[PDB]
Amino acid sequence: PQDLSEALKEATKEVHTQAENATRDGFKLVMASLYHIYVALEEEIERNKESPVFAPVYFPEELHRKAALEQDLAFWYGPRWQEVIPYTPAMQRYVKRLHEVGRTEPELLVAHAYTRYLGDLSGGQVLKKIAQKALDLPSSGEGLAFFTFPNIASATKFKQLYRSRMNSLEMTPAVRQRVIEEAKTAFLLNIQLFEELQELLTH
């Protein structure tokens, strides 16, 4: 395909089927996981927000997710969530890779921003309404903030604008190859993450 956007989609297809291997305690694990991941991702994004290899996909208001995961994590783990939430080896690895890329090879940062943001944006509605029912919650209205990007009205419109920005990114054939491989790496990290949360909730 032409677009780096189209190339990413294709690559993340033959890899978007794996791991169909996997309750409350589980949702709380995926929420805590996502928090540690977004803290590192968003930290690295800020550090590289003005560089030409990332500036085009810098959308701070539309996509930041740390604050929402914070509201949610306060509801799931309580007022002292920051002390109690877990931080496992698989979470640690995703976080380190995130830091390595942001520090050493920022041109690949777009790979992780895409996997995370566009993945969570279009998959949310599904991953939400679904697991939530099997969750049964009160009438309070907290805990699911992560699934709503308030500053985005049209998911469809935003994705189009986001993909076009990725396509505006000036890169070479070689760099394009690492961006795609890096996208594949992010899927592995996510896959292994769920794998570890499984060998955890079943022991």
Side-chain angles (χ1 to χ4, degrees):
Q2 340 137 61
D3 312 319
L4 164 60
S5 164
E6 283 176 33
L8 283 166
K9 168 100 67 49
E10 174 176 357
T12 68
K13 176 270 184 294
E14 189 269 358
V15 312
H16 199 293
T17 306
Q18 298 179 51
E20 325 87 346
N21 276 53
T23 80
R24 189 200 205 65
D25 290 46
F27 192 74
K28 304 181 65 175
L29 267 180
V30 298
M31 296 302 268
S33 281
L34 298 168
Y35 177 71
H36 293 123
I37 292 165
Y38 269 108
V39 164
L41 174 59
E42 269 158 39
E43 162 169 48
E44 288 306 327
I45 276 169
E46 275 302 304
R47 172 212 304 315
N48 296 94
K49 62 179 184 183
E50 283 185 54
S51 65
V53 311
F54 192 83
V57 305
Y58 181 61
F59 286 101
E61 299 297 293
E62 301 83 348
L63 305 160
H64 79 277
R65 228 78 288 268
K66 186 173 80 75
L69 279 165
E70 276 174 349
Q71 295 295 336
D72 293 354
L73 250 40
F75 172 77
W76 297 104
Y77 283 85
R80 288 129 98 197
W81 55 281
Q82 306 218 59
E83 294 180 69
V84 62
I85 57 169
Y87 186 40
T88 69
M91 299 180 188
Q92 294 168 298
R93 266 184 271 101
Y94 200 153
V95 162
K96 289 188 172 181
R97 183 50 192 151
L98 245 23
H99 285 322
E100 306 179 329
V101 166
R103 246 48 157 57
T104 66
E105 53 200 331
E107 336 81 61
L108 315 182
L109 196 53
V110 58
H112 284 102
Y114 166 84
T115 309
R116 217 51 270 179
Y117 295 119
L118 292 208
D120 290 358
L121 184 60
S122 54
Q125 323 72 73
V126 177
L127 314 169
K128 181 190 183 182
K129 67 166 298 302
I130 292 180
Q132 65 164 303
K133 308 301 172 55
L135 195 56
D136 181 63
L137 304 188
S139 291
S140 47
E142 306 176 61
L144 292 182
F146 170 64
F147 295 89
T148 301
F149 288 70
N151 296 141
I152 286 183
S154 177
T156 297
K157 254 187 165 114
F158 186 74
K159 297 168 142 300
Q160 217 256 298
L161 174 62
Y162 194 96
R163 298 199 223 297
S164 65
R165 288 296 194 73
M166 292 183 107
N167 300 334
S168 78
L169 248 29
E170 281 182 4
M171 52 182 77
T172 61
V175 170
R176 195 164 189 294
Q177 289 190 167
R178 313 213 205 89
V179 170
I180 289 177
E181 174 50 33
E182 195 55 36
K184 293 183 173 304
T185 293
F187 278 70
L188 173 56
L189 288 171
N190 273 286
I191 281 178
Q192 291 172 174
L193 180 57
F194 306 127
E195 296 189 312
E196 180 206 53
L197 303 186
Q198 190 61 59
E199 316 166 59
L200 212 167
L201 296 180
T202 65
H203 284 68

